[PDB]
């Protein structure tokens, strides 16, 4: 019963979707979001409009002239400025009821107890190593974990919600339900050298493998494929594909040899889509209403596919 | 004719089961669906294996097995 009349009028149309309880949950929820390029900016915008108690936006990187000349949290020409810091302004306008904080320290440098002021953590632009250290921390602390990224026309999200209790609506009201997630570590390292495995690999989007490739190019080069270095980057990609296919036993065409064309930079509409989905996964997670998707979402912006894969147990 | 159990799944992940005679005009099924679900008829679109199903199509014609699946897609018009 205890949100303001102000909030009631602005959240009106969402309260009518998911009820006052769920919105009271959101309102009590604090969120860490790491990296504020295209995907990060969508999530920020989405969670602030939803009215979480607070959002902390962490990015240690600054605005480059390689960075998109248009960014909706960031007034023009703000090159040299901290990303998280440039952003804060437009972002906080979205919703004065939300506590929007920034942090400029590199995510790797962050102690365990720093994560415990957050009911959910979401990673964008992080190296695989980061993704694992943080997921593990969040497991140790019963924090909801997410990661996501956009690569040209593709995007993915990932979720680890541990032992997750939620209520659903019953189609003729409310049903208690439970669903169990597993570490990123176990999800990014599947034994395909199995019988279960090689059987299920038939039904598994190549995008899961496109992921691995892209995560590697990120670990070994510390940036994602840029476009005005296309030629250089394309080969590196073609290469990496093979070494990684080798190490679990996959025939170098089960992931097309042609992918390289459409995974460069970030396509603004892909950020919107994937940030729409991920943001909504997070909302679902905090309000403990509706089933959350079992670990991965893969979006293919050419085909208009969005697949949800359970990859880890 | 003979019979099959078919299942209709909704976007709203609902899941209604039906027993239908292989010779049936699938419109009868659509009508069956909208009734057990309270929705006016052409408020919907029924898909079998990514492909549309018109009123007079038949489970035989579409080559439908036991246990098969039909997907209903409702067109939102807000925004």
């Amino acid at each position: 019963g205890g949100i303001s009349e102000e909030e009631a009028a602005q959240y009106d149309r969402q309260i009518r979707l998911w009820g006052l309880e769920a919105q009271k949950r959101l309102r009590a929820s604090r969120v860490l979001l790491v990296g504020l390029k295209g995907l990060g900016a969508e999530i920020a915008k989405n969670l602030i409009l939803a009215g979480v108690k607070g959002l902390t936006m962490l990015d240690h990187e600054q605005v480059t002239p390689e960075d998109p000349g248009a960014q909706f949290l960031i007034r023009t020409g703000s090159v040299g400025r901290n990303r998280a810091e440039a952003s804060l302004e437009r972002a906080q306008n979205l919703n004065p009821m939300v506590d929007v904080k920034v942090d400029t320290e590199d995510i790797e440098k962050k102690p365990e107890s720093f994560f415990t002021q957050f009911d959910a953590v979401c990673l964008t632009c992080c190296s695989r190593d980061v993704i694992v250290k943080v997921d593990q921390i969040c497991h140790k602390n019963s924090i909801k974990f997410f990661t996501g990224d956009v690569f040209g026309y593709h995007g993915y999200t990932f979720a680890n919600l541990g032992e997750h209790e939620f209520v659903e609506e019953k189609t003729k009201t409310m049903v208690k339900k439970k669903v169990v997630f597993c570490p990123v570590k176990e999800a990014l390292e599947v034994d395909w050298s199995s019988e279960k495995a090689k059987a299920a690999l038939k039904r598994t989007t190549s995008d899961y493998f496109l992921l691995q490739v892209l995560l590697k190019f990120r670990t070994d080069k510390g940036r994602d494929p840029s476009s005005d270095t296309y030629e250089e980057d394309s080969e590196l990609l073609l290469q990496i594909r093979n070494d990684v296919l080798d190490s679990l036993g996959i025939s170098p065409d089960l992931l097309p040899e042609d992918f390289v064309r459409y995974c460069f930079s970030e396509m603004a509409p892909v950020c919107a889509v994937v940030g729409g989905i991920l943001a909504q996964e997070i909302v679902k997670a905090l309000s403990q209403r509706d089933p959350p998707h079992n670990n991965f979402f893969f979006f293919d912006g050419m085909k208009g596919n969005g697949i949800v894969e359970c990859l880890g147990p | 004719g003979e019979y099959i159990k078919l299942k209709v799944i909704g976007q709203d992940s609902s899941e209604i089961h039906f027993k239908v005679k292989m010779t049936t005009h699938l419109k009868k099924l659509k009508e069956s669906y909208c009734q057990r679900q309270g929705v006016p008829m052409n408020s919907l679109r029924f898909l079998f294996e990514g492909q549309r199903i018109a009123d007079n199509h038949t489970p035989k014609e579409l080559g439908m097995e036991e246990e098969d699946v039909i997907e209903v897609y409702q067109e939102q018009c807000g925004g």
Partner: protein
């Protein structure tokens, strides 16, 4: 920018139209610019409102009451003042958005929240020959699709849902659900404060055939003789009318009779959100009364004899309908509902959130691109699901269908058949309920197809006013007559074939095409006994059983 030679020049090259600037709207505008769409037209007929602020991210509380389109442009500009945006604040149905206008664009994108504007925009793009991407959201769902003259079906190739309609007798005599009471309260508001409308009387209907085997005073007239006195209106509606209903006793042979209410008795006898509380009768009564007091005032603030227009967001209009519906409800033994629920049902509020619109607007630009680089053959209808389907799909891309030859819009010489009584139906009813409202024309011209070309309706204000009141038979229209309807603005032409019928059921004025209750009801029991005599002999065409 990150798109191939041809395409990126085509995007800085072309002009695009985004019709509507709400949820899908703002989201789209942002994507189109960040994708590098240099030339963009933007139109919304509306101002900013607080309930918008959870999903229309270009607008802040400081912006309430300004134009959605203009503020939208202001806001993009701050982040990217390079971008070109022309911003119209206006309905796209406005005569200035003619075929010529649509012809400039390489793409039109809908961002609308109603079927009427979509039926119009569909038509403009068939006429200007321009691909359109259509889309829609509600709650957690929505979809995107492409429409291309000559290639795919058009918006209206397939009948969509119509707005829910209730039989007059059900509203005025025998309500049985809260929606009937709320529809009654809207109509009453309309009789008292809006444009009096005979199809919307709230008084009991003596001519109900369920009730058969000097005039009484109408609602507006009874209002006028009492000067809109709250308590007399109460007594009239919730008491004297009910007494009369009780007179119509063949109605209550099986249903529980309504119980009339008395003003003085109700005053003598006297978490969640505030609006989520159900109050008592007394309270509704008092709110009904206060609501009249305030609306009588709003009505005196009108300039030049004008009427109120009902609005869910006007407190006292909303209270009026809340309190009136709850009292009608009680009288008929239904549990009363809260303002929050009533607002929802009365306003037809659709739940809406940010992420759903963000996802849809994202899909719109992607399909845009495909179209703009000749990959129209890769375009799909993409559905957004709440949960993944059996083949693991959350977004389900689906095959475009081709133009339906019997489409009453996009076909070569489109043509419909309408069934009506040529003696009951007037020109006005033809004009508003059939041509404008059912066939969604904006300002029709209508003539008889008889080479004299007898005129019925003109779009030229005060040309066919005299004809309004005349029944169709006064022109010779009858079975098989053929009329020709033109909407010059939509560049659309529809021939209407009349089927005369006398047997429609006095609320039902038309429909589109395309003893012995002891014998013919005890015959249904053995037309069902015979229907499943052949079912249980492995020999019947159509048979579906529901399980679970």
């Amino acid at each position: 920018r990150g798109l191939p030679r041809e395409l990126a020049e085509a995007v800085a090259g072309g002009r695009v139209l985004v019709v509507g600037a709400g949820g899908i709207g703002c989201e789209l505008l942002k994507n189109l610019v960040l994708t590098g769409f240099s030339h963009i037209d933007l139109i919304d007929l509306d101002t900013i409102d607080v309930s918008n602020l959870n999903r229309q991210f270009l607008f802040q509380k400081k912006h309430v009451g300004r134009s959605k389109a203009q503020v939208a442009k202001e806001s993009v500009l701050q982040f990217y003042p390079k971008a070109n945006i022309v911003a119209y604040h206006d309905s796209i149905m406005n005569p200035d958005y003619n075929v010529e206008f649509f012809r400039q664009f390489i793409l039109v994108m809908n961002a609308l929240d109603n079927r009427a504007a979509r039926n119009h925009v569909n038509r403009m793009c068939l006429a200007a020959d321009v691909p359109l991407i259509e889309s829609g959201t509600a709650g957690y769902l929505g979809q995107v699709t492409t429409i291309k003259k000559g290639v795919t079906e058009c918006y209206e190739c397939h009948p969509k849902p119509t707005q829910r309609t209730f039989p007059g007798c059900t509203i005025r005599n025998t309500p049985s659900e809260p929606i009937h009471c709320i529809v009654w309260a809207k109509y009453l508001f309309n009789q008292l404060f809006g444009e009096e409308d005979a199809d919307q009387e709230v008084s009991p209907d003596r001519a109900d055939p369920e009730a058969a085997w000097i005039k009484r005073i109408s609602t507006k007239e009874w209002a006028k003789s009492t000067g809109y006195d709250p308590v007399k209106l109460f007594t009239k509606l919730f008491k004297d009318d009910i007494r009369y209903l009780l007179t119509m006793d063949k109605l209550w042979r099986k249903r529980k009779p309504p119980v009339p209410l008395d003003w003085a008795e109700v005053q003598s006898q006297g978490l969640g959100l505030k609006d989520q509380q159900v109050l008592d009768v007394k309270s509704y009564a008092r709110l009904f009364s206060k609501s009249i007091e305030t609306l009588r005032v709003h009505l005196a603030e009108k300039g030049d004899g004008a009427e109120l227009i009902w609005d869910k967001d006007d407190p006292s209009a909303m209270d009026f309908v809340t309190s009136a519906a709850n009292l009608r409800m009680h009288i008929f033994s239904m549990n009363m509902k809260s303002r929050f629920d009533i607002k929802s049902m009365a306003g037809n509020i659709i739940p809406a959130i940010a992420t759903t619109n963000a996802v849809i607007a994202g899909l719109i630009v992607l399909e845009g691109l495909k179209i703009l680089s000749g990959k129209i053959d890769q375009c799909r209808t993409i559905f957004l699901n709440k949960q993944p389907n059996p083949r693991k799909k959350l977004l389900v891309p689906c095959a475009l269908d081709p133009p339906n030859p019997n489409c009453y819009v996009c076909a070569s010489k489109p043509e419909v058949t309408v069934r009506l009584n040529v003696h009951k139906v007037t020109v006005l009813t033809l004009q508003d309920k059939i041509v404008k409202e059912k066939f969604a024309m904006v300002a029709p011209d209508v003539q008889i197809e008889d080479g004299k070309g007898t005129i019925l309706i003109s779009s030229e204000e005060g040309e066919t006013e005299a004809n309004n009141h005349k029944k169709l038979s006064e022109f010779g229209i009858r079975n098989g007559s053929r009329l020709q309807a033109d909407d010059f603005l939509q560049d659309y032409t529809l021939l209407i074939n009349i089927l005369h019928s006398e047997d429609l059921g006095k609320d039902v004025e038309f429909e589109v095409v395309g003893e012995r209750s002891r014998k013919r009801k005890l015959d249904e029991k053995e037309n069902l006994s015979a229907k499943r005599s052949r079912i249980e002999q492995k020999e019947e065409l159509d048979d579906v059983i529901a399980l679970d």
